[PDB]
Amino acid sequence: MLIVPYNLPLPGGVVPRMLITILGTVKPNANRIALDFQRGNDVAFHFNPRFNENNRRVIVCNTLLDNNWGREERQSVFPFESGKPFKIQVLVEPDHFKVAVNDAHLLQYNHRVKKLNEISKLGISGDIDLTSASYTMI
Ligand SMILES: CC(=O)N[C@H]1[C@H](O[C@H]2[C@@H](O)[C@@H](CO)O[C@@H](O[C@H]3[C@H](O)[C@@H](O)[C@H](O)O[C@@H]3CO)[C@@H]2O)O[C@H](CO)[C@@H](O[C@@H]2O[C@H](CO)[C@H](O)[C@H](O)[C@H]2O)[C@@H]1O
Ligand SMILES: [Cl-]
Fold this sequence. Notes:
Its main location: cytoplasm. The protein is mostly beta strands and 138 residues long.
């Protein structure tokens, strides 16, 4: 069981056909989870399940550039459940990150950061027991 927050190096950044797989279990009474794909200090792709934003569950995605958040993209489909094991798969495609949870497609997030080969860390944080984090080329 990995320590959270957890940093997964992505050597040489990301590239299309790279698949990143995160396995974990959501804590009971979770508040948040975040996956941050980072280019140095910038966050190219922030993937942020929120379990109680005004008593609603929502996924917030965004990009942080020079310490400024951009326009949020919001998804009301919410596949996570407190207490339950999950699998997040992030497939890098040419124009977007494609995210599936528990083998069901969830969302896509268009690339705002263009230097994909400089997105060289994944930060995993929030209210989970983290089991594993890895990548493979498909
Ligand atoms: C307070 C908090 O949760 N801070 C987090 C940071 O959250 C921010 C992020 O989710 C952005 C995405 O757009 O939204 C921010 O909230 C906005 C509301 O959505 C919006 O309705 C309102 O008008 O404006 C709000 C603020 O703009 C939200 O605060 O997310 C970052 C990245 O995950 C967190 O930083 C990381 O924290 C981890 C540990 O959790 C480590 O410290 C990492 O090093 C660090 O990058 C930040 O803590
Ligand atoms: Cl860029």
